[PDB]
Amino acid sequence: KDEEFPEQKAGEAINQPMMMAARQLHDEARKWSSKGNDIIAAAKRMALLMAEMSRLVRGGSGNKRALIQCAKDIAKASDEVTRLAKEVAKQCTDKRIRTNLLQVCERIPTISTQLKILSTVKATMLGRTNISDEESEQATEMLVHNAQNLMQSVKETVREAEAASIKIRTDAGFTLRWVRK
């Protein structure tokens, strides 16, 4: 059914924080079936792409273009998540839940744009042993922080969209399919 996620190695959280952030999104999205639910499909795609970004930043100058494209792909998926979350908010009859859902999903676009910017920075840095240790470390920290914020925001968006899909005045067939996997 779903694609498998990379095996977790000892020390992943500290050594590969973007992989851990990606794993947290995967863990949330895997609770649900992708059939009839493009938010979940997009979220699973995003977690796998971030896993790839994690692998790419540990490489050399040869991964420059791949790193940039990976960020591009992540942003495209994030735009799909935002669009679908907005529709679910529209169908939600609970004003509070609608507001909160819009609140969290509306931030995804800016975070993904920032991800593309920071990925580009790290990309042009890869393999160049002529760069300051401080500059390389801070670029990494910035990208890691942004990846964590994007994964956390998408994770919360999935959660709120699911609860919001129950607060509708039509039958279940008018919105995203939410069936536990």
Domain ranges of the chain: 1-181
The class of domain 1-181 in CATH terms is: mainly alpha
Q: What is the DSSP secondary-structure string of the chain? A: -PPPPPPPPTTHHHH-HHHHHHHHHHHHHTTB--TT-HHHHHHHHHHHHHHHHHHHTTS-GGGHHHHHHHHHHHHHHHHHHHHHHHHHHHH---HHHHHHHHHHHTTHHHHHHHHHHHHHHHHHHTT-TTS-HHHHHHHHHHHHHHHHHHHHHHHHHHHHHHHHTTS-SS-GGGS----B-
Method: X-ray
